[PDB]
Coordinates of N, CA and C in Angstrom, one line a residue:
Chain A
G54 CA 88.0 95.5 122.9 C 87.6 95.0 121.6
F55 N 86.3 94.7 121.4 CA 85.9 93.9 120.3 C 86.3 94.6 119.0
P56 N 86.9 93.9 118.0 CA 86.9 92.4 117.9 C 88.2 91.8 118.5
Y57 N 89.0 92.6 119.1 CA 90.1 92.0 119.9 C 89.5 91.2 121.0
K58 N 90.3 90.2 121.6 CA 89.7 89.4 122.7 C 90.4 89.8 124.0
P59 N 89.8 89.4 125.1 CA 90.5 89.5 126.4 C 91.8 88.6 126.3
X60 N 92.9 89.0 127.0 CA 92.9 90.3 127.8 C 93.5 91.4 127.0
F61 N 93.6 91.3 125.6 CA 94.1 92.4 124.8 C 93.1 93.6 124.8
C62 N 91.8 93.2 124.6 CA 90.7 94.2 124.6 C 90.4 94.7 126.1
Chain B
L93 N 86.4 97.5 133.8 CA 86.3 98.3 132.5 C 85.0 98.0 131.8
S94 N 85.1 97.9 130.5 CA 83.9 97.7 129.6 C 83.4 96.2 129.6
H95 N 84.2 95.3 130.2 CA 83.7 93.9 130.5 C 84.5 93.4 131.7
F96 N 83.8 92.5 132.5 CA 84.4 92.1 133.8 C 85.1 90.7 133.7
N97 N 84.7 89.9 132.7 CA 85.3 88.5 132.6 C 85.0 88.1 131.2
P98 N 85.5 86.9 130.8 CA 85.4 86.5 129.4 C 83.9 86.3 129.0
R99 N 83.1 85.8 129.9 CA 81.7 85.6 129.6 C 80.9 86.9 129.4
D100 N 81.1 87.9 130.2 CA 80.6 89.2 130.0 C 80.9 89.8 128.6
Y101 N 82.2 89.6 128.3 CA 82.7 89.9 126.9 C 81.9 89.2 125.8
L102 N 81.7 87.9 126.0 CA 80.9 87.2 125.0 C 79.4 87.7 125.0
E103 N 78.8 87.9 126.2 CA 77.4 88.4 126.2 C 77.3 89.8 125.6
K104 N 78.3 90.6 125.7 CA 78.2 92.0 125.2 C 78.3 92.0 123.7
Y105 N 79.1 91.1 123.1 CA 79.5 91.3 121.7 C 79.1 90.2 120.7
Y106 N 78.7 89.0 121.2 CA 78.6 87.9 120.3 C 77.2 87.2 120.2
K107 N 76.2 88.0 120.8 CA 74.8 87.5 120.8 C 74.2 87.6 119.4
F108 N 74.7 88.4 118.5 CA 74.3 88.4 117.1 C 72.8 88.6 116.8
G109 N 72.2 89.4 117.7 CA 70.8 89.6 117.6 C 70.3 90.8 116.9
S110 N 71.3 91.7 116.7 CA 71.0 93.0 115.9 C 71.8 93.1 114.6
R111 N 71.1 92.9 113.5 CA 71.8 92.8 112.2 C 72.6 94.0 111.8
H112 N 72.3 95.2 112.2 CA 73.0 96.4 111.8 C 74.1 96.9 112.8
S113 N 74.2 96.2 114.0 CA 75.2 96.6 115.0 C 76.6 96.6 114.4
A114 N 77.5 97.4 114.9 CA 79.0 97.2 114.5 C 79.5 95.8 114.6
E115 N 79.2 95.1 115.8 CA 79.6 93.8 116.0 C 79.1 92.7 115.0
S116 N 77.9 92.8 114.7 CA 77.3 91.8 113.7 C 78.0 92.0 112.4
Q117 N 78.2 93.2 112.0 CA 78.8 93.5 110.7 C 80.2 93.0 110.6
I118 N 81.0 93.3 111.6 CA 82.4 92.8 111.7 C 82.4 91.3 111.7
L119 N 81.6 90.7 112.6 CA 81.5 89.3 112.7 C 81.1 88.6 111.3
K120 N 80.1 89.2 110.6 CA 79.8 88.7 109.3 C 81.0 88.7 108.3
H121 N 81.8 89.8 108.3 CA 82.9 89.9 107.4 C 84.0 88.9 107.7
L122 N 84.2 88.7 109.0 CA 85.2 87.7 109.4 C 84.8 86.3 108.9
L123 N 83.5 86.1 109.2 CA 82.9 84.8 108.9 C 82.8 84.4 107.4
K124 N 82.4 85.4 106.6 CA 82.4 85.2 105.1 C 83.8 84.9 104.7
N125 N 84.8 85.6 105.2 CA 86.2 85.4 104.9 C 86.8 84.1 105.3
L126 N 86.5 83.6 106.5 CA 86.9 82.3 106.9 C 86.2 81.2 106.1
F127 N 84.9 81.4 105.7 CA 84.2 80.4 104.8 C 84.9 80.3 103.5
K128 N 85.2 81.5 102.9 CA 86.0 81.6 101.7 C 87.4 80.8 101.8
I129 N 88.2 81.1 102.8 CA 89.4 80.4 103.0 C 89.3 78.9 103.2
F130 N 88.5 78.5 104.1 CA 88.5 77.0 104.5 C 87.6 76.2 103.6
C131 N 86.5 76.7 103.0 CA 85.6 76.0 102.2 C 85.8 76.2 100.7
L132 N 85.8 77.4 100.2 CA 86.0 77.7 98.8 C 87.5 77.6 98.3
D133 N 88.4 78.3 98.9 CA 89.8 78.3 98.5 C 90.5 77.0 98.9
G134 N 89.7 76.1 99.5 CA 90.3 74.8 99.9 C 91.6 74.7 100.7
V135 N 91.7 75.5 101.8 CA 92.8 75.4 102.8 C 92.3 74.2 103.7
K136 N 93.1 73.2 103.8 CA 92.7 71.9 104.3 C 93.8 71.1 104.9
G137 N 93.5 70.1 105.7 CA 94.6 69.3 106.2 C 94.1 68.5 107.5
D138 N 95.1 68.0 108.2 CA 94.8 67.1 109.3 C 94.7 67.9 110.6
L139 N 95.8 68.6 110.9 CA 95.9 69.3 112.2 C 95.9 70.9 112.0
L140 N 95.0 71.6 112.6 CA 95.0 73.1 112.6 C 95.2 73.6 114.1
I141 N 96.1 74.5 114.3 CA 96.3 75.1 115.6 C 95.8 76.5 115.6
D142 N 94.8 76.8 116.5 CA 94.2 78.2 116.6 C 94.9 79.0 117.7
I143 N 95.4 80.1 117.3 CA 96.3 80.9 118.2 C 95.4 82.1 118.7
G144 N 95.3 82.3 120.0 CA 94.5 83.4 120.5 C 93.0 83.1 120.3
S145 N 92.6 81.9 120.6 CA 91.2 81.6 120.5 C 90.3 82.4 121.4
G146 N 90.9 82.9 122.5 CA 90.1 83.6 123.5 C 88.9 82.7 123.9
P147 N 87.8 83.2 124.3 CA 86.6 82.5 124.7 C 85.7 82.2 123.5
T148 N 86.2 82.5 122.3 CA 85.3 82.4 121.1 C 85.4 81.1 120.3
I149 N 84.4 80.7 119.6 CA 84.5 79.5 118.7 C 84.2 80.0 117.2
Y150 N 83.8 81.2 117.0 CA 83.3 81.6 115.7 C 84.3 81.3 114.5
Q151 N 85.6 81.4 114.9 CA 86.7 81.3 113.9 C 87.0 79.9 113.6
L152 N 86.4 79.0 114.2 CA 86.6 77.5 114.0 C 85.4 76.9 113.3
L153 N 84.4 77.6 113.0 CA 83.2 77.0 112.5 C 83.3 76.5 111.0
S154 N 83.8 77.3 110.1 CA 84.1 76.8 108.8 C 85.3 75.8 108.8
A155 N 86.4 76.1 109.6 CA 87.6 75.3 109.7 C 87.4 73.9 110.1
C156 N 86.4 73.6 110.9 CA 86.1 72.2 111.3 C 85.5 71.3 110.1
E157 N 85.1 72.0 109.1 CA 84.8 71.2 107.8 C 86.0 70.8 107.1
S158 N 87.2 71.4 107.4 CA 88.4 71.2 106.6 C 89.5 70.6 107.3
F159 N 89.5 70.5 108.6 CA 90.6 69.9 109.4 C 90.0 68.9 110.3
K160 N 90.7 67.8 110.4 CA 90.3 66.6 111.2 C 90.4 66.9 112.7
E161 N 91.6 67.4 113.1 CA 91.8 67.9 114.5 C 92.0 69.4 114.5
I162 N 91.4 70.1 115.5 CA 91.7 71.4 115.8 C 92.2 71.6 117.3
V163 N 93.4 72.1 117.5 CA 93.9 72.5 118.8 C 93.6 73.9 119.1
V164 N 92.8 74.2 120.2 CA 92.5 75.6 120.5 C 93.5 76.1 121.6
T165 N 93.9 77.3 121.5 CA 94.9 77.8 122.4 C 94.7 79.3 122.7
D166 N 95.3 79.7 123.9 CA 95.2 81.1 124.4 C 96.2 81.4 125.5
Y167 N 96.6 82.6 125.6 CA 97.4 83.0 126.7 C 96.7 83.0 128.0
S168 N 95.3 83.2 128.0 CA 94.6 83.4 129.2 C 93.8 82.1 129.6
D169 N 94.1 81.6 130.8 CA 93.5 80.4 131.2 C 92.0 80.6 131.5
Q170 N 91.6 81.8 131.9 CA 90.2 82.1 132.1 C 89.4 82.1 130.7
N171 N 90.1 82.6 129.7 CA 89.5 82.4 128.3 C 89.2 80.9 128.0
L172 N 90.3 80.1 128.2 CA 90.1 78.6 128.0 C 89.0 77.9 128.8
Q173 N 88.8 78.3 130.1 CA 87.7 77.7 130.9 C 86.4 78.1 130.3
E174 N 86.2 79.3 129.8 CA 84.9 79.7 129.2 C 84.7 78.9 128.0
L175 N 85.7 78.7 127.2 CA 85.7 78.0 126.0 C 85.3 76.5 126.3
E176 N 86.0 75.9 127.3 CA 85.7 74.5 127.8 C 84.3 74.2 128.3
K177 N 83.7 75.2 129.0 CA 82.3 75.2 129.4 C 81.4 74.9 128.2
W178 N 81.7 75.5 127.0 CA 81.0 75.2 125.8 C 81.3 73.9 125.1
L179 N 82.6 73.5 125.1 CA 83.0 72.3 124.4 C 82.4 71.1 125.1
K180 N 82.5 71.2 126.5 CA 81.9 70.1 127.3 C 80.4 70.1 127.5
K181 N 79.7 71.0 126.9 CA 78.3 71.3 127.1 C 78.1 71.5 128.6
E182 N 79.0 72.0 129.4 CA 78.8 72.3 130.9 C 77.6 73.2 131.1
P183 N 77.1 73.4 132.3 CA 75.9 74.2 132.6 C 76.1 75.7 132.2
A184 N 75.2 76.3 131.6 CA 75.2 77.8 131.4 C 76.4 78.1 130.5
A185 N 76.7 77.4 129.5 CA 77.7 77.7 128.4 C 77.1 78.8 127.6
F186 N 77.9 79.6 126.9 CA 77.4 80.7 126.1 C 76.5 80.1 125.0
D187 N 75.5 80.8 124.6 CA 74.7 80.3 123.5 C 75.3 80.8 122.1
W188 N 76.0 79.9 121.5 CA 76.6 80.2 120.1 C 75.7 80.0 119.0
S189 N 74.5 79.5 119.2 CA 73.6 79.0 118.1 C 73.4 80.1 117.0
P190 N 73.2 81.3 117.4 CA 72.9 82.3 116.3 C 74.1 82.5 115.3
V191 N 75.3 82.5 115.8 CA 76.5 82.6 115.0 C 76.7 81.2 114.2
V192 N 76.5 80.1 114.9 CA 76.5 78.8 114.3 C 75.6 78.7 113.1
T193 N 74.3 79.1 113.3 CA 73.3 79.1 112.2 C 73.7 80.0 111.1
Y194 N 74.2 81.2 111.4 CA 74.7 82.1 110.4 C 75.7 81.4 109.4
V195 N 76.6 80.6 110.0 CA 77.7 80.0 109.3 C 77.0 78.9 108.5
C196 N 76.1 78.1 109.1 CA 75.4 77.1 108.3 C 74.7 77.7 107.1
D197 N 74.1 78.9 107.2 CA 73.5 79.7 106.1 C 74.6 79.9 105.0
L198 N 75.8 80.4 105.4 CA 76.8 80.7 104.4 C 77.2 79.5 103.7
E199 N 77.3 78.4 104.4 CA 77.7 77.1 103.8 C 76.6 76.4 103.0
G200 N 75.5 77.1 102.8 CA 74.4 76.6 101.9 C 73.3 75.9 102.6
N201 N 73.1 76.1 103.9 CA 72.2 75.3 104.7 C 72.1 73.8 104.4
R202 N 73.3 73.2 104.3 CA 73.4 71.8 104.1 C 73.3 71.1 105.5
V203 N 73.6 71.8 106.5 CA 73.5 71.3 107.9 C 72.7 72.3 108.8
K204 N 72.1 71.8 109.9 CA 71.5 72.6 110.9 C 72.5 72.7 112.1
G205 N 72.3 73.7 112.9 CA 73.2 74.0 114.1 C 73.8 72.9 114.9
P206 N 72.9 72.0 115.5 CA 73.5 70.9 116.3 C 74.5 70.0 115.6
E207 N 74.3 69.7 114.4 CA 75.3 68.8 113.6 C 76.7 69.6 113.5
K208 N 76.6 70.9 113.1 CA 77.8 71.7 113.0 C 78.5 71.8 114.3
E209 N 77.8 72.0 115.4 CA 78.3 72.1 116.8 C 79.0 70.8 117.2
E210 N 78.4 69.7 116.9 CA 78.9 68.4 117.2 C 80.2 68.1 116.4
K211 N 80.2 68.5 115.1 CA 81.4 68.4 114.4 C 82.6 69.2 114.9
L212 N 82.4 70.4 115.4 CA 83.5 71.2 116.1 C 83.9 70.5 117.4
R213 N 82.9 70.1 118.2 CA 83.3 69.4 119.5 C 84.1 68.2 119.2
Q214 N 83.9 67.5 118.2 CA 84.7 66.3 117.8 C 86.1 66.6 117.3
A215 N 86.2 67.7 116.6 CA 87.5 68.2 116.1 C 88.4 68.6 117.2
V216 N 87.8 69.1 118.3 CA 88.7 69.8 119.3 C 89.0 68.8 120.4
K217 N 90.3 68.5 120.6 CA 90.8 67.5 121.5 C 91.7 68.1 122.6
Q218 N 92.5 69.1 122.2 CA 93.4 69.7 123.1 C 93.1 71.3 123.3
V219 N 93.0 71.7 124.5 CA 92.8 73.1 124.9 C 94.0 73.6 125.6
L220 N 95.0 74.3 125.0 CA 96.3 74.6 125.5 C 96.6 76.0 125.7
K221 N 97.6 76.3 126.6 CA 98.2 77.6 126.7 C 99.1 77.9 125.6
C222 N 99.0 79.1 125.0 CA 99.9 79.6 124.0 C 100.6 80.9 124.4
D223 N 101.8 81.1 124.2 CA 102.5 82.3 124.4 C 103.3 82.6 123.1
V224 N 102.7 83.5 122.2 CA 103.4 83.7 120.9 C 104.9 84.3 121.0
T225 N 105.2 84.9 122.2 CA 106.6 85.3 122.4 C 107.6 84.2 122.6
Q226 N 107.1 83.0 122.9 CA 108.0 81.9 123.2 C 108.4 81.1 122.0
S227 N 109.7 80.7 122.0 CA 110.3 79.9 120.9 C 109.5 78.6 120.7
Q228 N 109.1 78.0 121.8 CA 108.1 77.0 121.8 C 106.7 77.6 122.3
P229 N 105.9 78.2 121.5 CA 104.7 78.9 121.9 C 103.8 78.0 122.8
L230 N 103.8 76.7 122.6 CA 103.0 75.8 123.4 C 103.7 75.2 124.6
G231 N 104.9 75.8 124.9 CA 105.7 75.3 126.0 C 106.2 73.9 125.8
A232 N 106.0 73.1 126.8 CA 106.6 71.7 126.8 C 105.6 70.7 126.2
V233 N 104.4 71.1 125.9 CA 103.4 70.2 125.3 C 104.0 69.7 124.0
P234 N 104.1 68.4 123.7 CA 104.5 67.9 122.4 C 103.3 67.9 121.5
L235 N 103.5 68.4 120.3 CA 102.4 68.3 119.3 C 103.1 68.0 118.0
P236 N 102.5 67.0 117.2 CA 103.1 66.8 115.9 C 103.0 68.1 115.0
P237 N 103.9 68.3 114.0 CA 103.9 69.5 113.2 C 102.5 69.6 112.5
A238 N 102.0 70.8 112.5 CA 100.6 71.0 112.0 C 100.5 71.4 110.5
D239 N 99.3 71.3 109.9 CA 99.1 71.7 108.5 C 98.6 73.1 108.4
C240 N 98.2 73.7 109.5 CA 97.7 75.1 109.5 C 97.8 75.7 110.8
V241 N 98.2 77.0 110.9 CA 98.1 77.8 112.1 C 97.2 78.9 111.7
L242 N 96.2 79.2 112.5 CA 95.2 80.2 112.3 C 95.3 81.2 113.4
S243 N 95.3 82.5 113.0 CA 95.3 83.5 114.1 C 94.4 84.6 113.6
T244 N 93.2 84.7 114.3 CA 92.3 85.8 114.0 C 92.2 86.8 115.1
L245 N 92.5 88.0 114.8 CA 92.5 89.2 115.7 C 93.3 89.1 116.9
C246 N 94.4 88.3 116.8 CA 95.3 88.1 118.0 C 96.6 88.8 117.8
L247 N 97.3 88.5 116.7 CA 98.7 88.9 116.5 C 99.0 90.4 116.6
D248 N 98.2 91.2 116.0 CA 98.4 92.6 116.0 C 98.3 93.1 117.5
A249 N 97.3 92.6 118.2 CA 97.0 93.0 119.6 C 98.1 92.4 120.5
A250 N 98.5 91.2 120.2 CA 99.5 90.6 121.1 C 100.9 91.2 121.0
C251 N 101.2 91.9 119.9 CA 102.6 92.3 119.7 C 102.7 93.9 119.5
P252 N 103.2 94.6 120.5 CA 103.3 96.0 120.4 C 104.3 96.5 119.3
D253 N 105.4 95.8 119.3 CA 106.6 96.1 118.4 C 106.5 95.3 117.1
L254 N 107.0 95.9 116.0 CA 107.3 95.2 114.8 C 108.3 94.1 115.0
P255 N 109.4 94.3 115.9 CA 110.3 93.1 116.2 C 109.6 92.0 117.0
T256 N 108.7 92.4 117.9 CA 107.9 91.4 118.6 C 107.0 90.6 117.6
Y257 N 106.3 91.3 116.7 CA 105.4 90.7 115.7 C 106.3 89.8 114.8
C258 N 107.4 90.2 114.3 CA 108.2 89.2 113.5 C 108.6 88.0 114.2
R259 N 109.0 88.1 115.4 CA 109.4 86.9 116.2 C 108.3 85.9 116.4
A260 N 107.1 86.5 116.8 CA 105.9 85.7 116.9 C 105.6 84.9 115.7
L261 N 105.7 85.5 114.5 CA 105.5 84.9 113.2 C 106.5 83.7 113.0
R262 N 107.7 83.9 113.4 CA 108.7 82.8 113.4 C 108.5 81.7 114.5
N263 N 108.2 82.2 115.7 CA 107.7 81.2 116.8 C 106.5 80.4 116.3
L264 N 105.5 81.0 115.7 CA 104.4 80.2 115.1 C 104.8 79.2 114.0
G265 N 105.8 79.6 113.1 CA 106.4 78.7 112.1 C 106.9 77.4 112.7
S266 N 107.4 77.5 114.0 CA 108.0 76.3 114.6 C 106.9 75.2 114.8
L267 N 105.6 75.6 114.8 CA 104.5 74.7 114.9 C 104.1 74.0 113.6
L268 N 104.6 74.4 112.5 CA 104.1 74.0 111.2 C 105.1 73.1 110.4
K269 N 104.6 72.2 109.7 CA 105.3 71.5 108.6 C 105.7 72.5 107.5
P270 N 106.8 72.1 106.8 CA 107.1 72.8 105.5 C 105.9 72.7 104.6
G271 N 105.6 73.8 104.0 CA 104.4 73.9 103.1 C 103.1 74.3 103.9
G272 N 103.2 74.2 105.2 CA 102.1 74.4 106.1 C 101.5 75.8 106.0
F273 N 100.1 75.8 106.1 CA 99.4 77.1 105.9 C 99.5 78.0 107.2
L274 N 99.7 79.3 106.9 CA 99.5 80.3 108.0 C 98.4 81.2 107.5
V275 N 97.3 81.3 108.3 CA 96.1 82.1 108.0 C 96.0 83.2 109.1
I276 N 96.2 84.5 108.7 CA 96.1 85.6 109.6 C 94.9 86.4 109.2
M277 N 94.0 86.8 110.2 CA 93.0 87.8 109.9 C 93.3 88.8 111.1
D278 N 93.2 90.1 110.7 CA 93.5 91.1 111.7 C 93.1 92.5 111.1
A279 N 93.2 93.5 111.9 CA 92.8 94.8 111.4 C 94.1 95.7 111.1
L280 N 94.0 96.5 110.2 CA 95.0 97.6 110.1 C 94.3 98.9 110.6
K281 N 94.5 99.3 111.8 CA 93.8 100.4 112.4 C 94.1 101.7 111.7
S282 N 93.1 102.6 111.4 CA 93.4 103.9 110.9 C 94.1 104.8 111.9
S283 N 94.5 106.0 111.5 CA 95.0 107.0 112.5 C 94.0 107.8 113.3
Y284 N 92.7 107.7 112.9 CA 91.6 108.5 113.5 C 91.5 108.2 115.0
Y285 N 91.4 109.3 115.8 CA 91.3 109.2 117.2 C 92.4 108.4 117.9
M286 N 93.6 108.3 117.3 CA 94.7 107.5 117.8 C 95.6 108.3 118.8
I287 N 95.8 107.7 119.9 CA 96.8 108.1 120.9 C 98.1 107.3 120.8
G288 N 99.2 107.9 120.5 CA 100.5 107.1 120.2 C 100.5 106.6 118.8
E289 N 101.5 105.7 118.5 CA 101.7 105.2 117.2 C 101.5 103.6 117.1
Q290 N 101.3 103.2 115.8 CA 100.9 101.8 115.6 C 101.9 101.1 114.6
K291 N 102.0 99.8 114.7 CA 102.8 99.0 113.9 C 102.7 99.4 112.4
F292 N 101.5 99.4 111.8 CA 101.3 99.7 110.4 C 100.4 100.9 110.1
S293 N 100.4 101.4 108.9 CA 99.3 102.3 108.4 C 98.3 101.4 107.7
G294 N 99.8 100.1 104.4 CA 100.0 99.2 105.4 C 100.1 97.7 105.0
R295 N 99.4 97.4 103.9 CA 99.5 96.1 103.2 C 101.0 95.7 103.1
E296 N 101.8 96.5 102.5 CA 103.3 96.3 102.2 C 104.1 95.9 103.5
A297 N 103.8 96.6 104.6 CA 104.6 96.3 105.8 C 104.2 95.0 106.4
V298 N 102.9 94.7 106.4 CA 102.5 93.4 107.0 C 103.1 92.2 106.1
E299 N 103.0 92.3 104.8 CA 103.6 91.3 103.9 C 105.1 91.2 104.1
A300 N 105.8 92.3 104.3 CA 107.2 92.2 104.4 C 107.6 91.4 105.6
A301 N 106.8 91.7 106.7 CA 107.0 91.0 107.9 C 106.8 89.5 107.8
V302 N 105.7 89.1 107.1 CA 105.4 87.7 106.9 C 106.4 87.0 106.0
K303 N 106.8 87.6 104.9 CA 107.8 87.1 104.0 C 109.1 87.0 104.8
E304 N 109.6 88.0 105.5 CA 110.9 88.0 106.1 C 110.8 87.0 107.3
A305 N 109.7 86.7 107.8 CA 109.5 85.7 108.9 C 109.7 84.3 108.4
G306 N 109.7 84.1 107.1 CA 109.9 82.8 106.5 C 108.7 82.2 105.8
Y307 N 107.8 83.0 105.3 CA 106.6 82.4 104.6 C 106.5 83.0 103.2
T308 N 105.8 82.3 102.3 CA 105.4 82.8 101.0 C 103.9 83.1 101.1
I309 N 103.5 84.3 100.6 CA 102.2 84.7 100.6 C 101.4 84.2 99.4
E310 N 100.3 83.6 99.7 CA 99.5 83.1 98.7 C 98.4 84.0 98.4
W311 N 97.7 84.6 99.4 CA 96.9 85.7 99.1 C 96.7 86.6 100.3
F312 N 96.4 87.9 99.9 CA 96.2 89.0 100.9 C 95.0 89.7 100.3
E313 N 94.0 89.9 101.2 CA 92.8 90.7 100.8 C 92.3 91.5 102.0
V314 N 92.1 92.8 101.7 CA 91.2 93.6 102.5 C 89.8 93.1 102.6
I315 N 89.1 93.2 103.7 CA 87.8 92.7 103.9 C 86.8 93.9 103.9
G316 N 89.6 98.7 108.8 CA 90.5 98.0 107.8 C 90.9 96.6 108.2
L317 N 90.0 95.6 107.9 CA 90.2 94.2 108.2 C 90.9 93.5 107.0
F318 N 91.8 92.7 107.3 CA 92.5 91.9 106.2 C 92.6 90.5 106.5
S319 N 92.8 89.7 105.4 CA 93.0 88.3 105.6 C 94.3 88.0 104.8
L320 N 95.1 87.1 105.3 CA 96.3 86.7 104.6 C 96.5 85.2 104.7
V321 N 96.8 84.6 103.6 CA 97.1 83.1 103.6 C 98.5 83.0 103.1
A322 N 99.3 82.3 103.9 CA 100.7 82.1 103.6 C 101.1 80.6 103.8
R323 N 102.3 80.2 103.3 CA 102.9 78.8 103.4 C 104.2 79.0 104.0
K324 N 104.6 78.1 105.0 CA 105.9 78.1 105.6 C 106.9 77.7 104.5
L325 N 108.0 78.4 104.4 CA 109.1 78.1 103.5 C 110.1 77.0 104.1

């Protein structure tokens, strides 16, 4: 990861 | 790892029940900024495309007051299904009400949660796959040219290289009308506790990328979170 979103986090 | 699926991710970070948590604070800054962009600064139009929506709706809550249709998109199909569970009011959808009401607060408590929620559900008609690396990021799906492309916390993470980043920005441009808005919100990560190197340190390098990708910058603001509003040339 937060505040990146899946699947980057 | 630290979450097992998109819903676990949502339950861990978006319940908005602790005012001083790192997540609430970040989410309030993103949200104040999106309210500023779409409600005060009057970024407006007919069609908005949301790039890297993930399983979240927070980035669409002010936007649905300003755009007639919103297309939500993501690389991950599992993200989209979690998102759809909420849009369709399917069983056991995530509870967004706390974030929804917060945004209603910012907007001056002119509306209560359910009306806001219904307005976003009506705005959203297409839930599509996006791949920012592709010349046609939406693949073969035909979509009229849009008035805005919004990308919150996606591009920096989606693109390891500066060359990847630049191409994505041009790929996104292909979805927009001339004059069309590009709204990016993202972080410029510090060097603290960093393993390896990162695209930027940093304002100047992100701008140059956006400019050289074919846009004019209307405004750039630090929130290291930043917001950038551009127009396709």
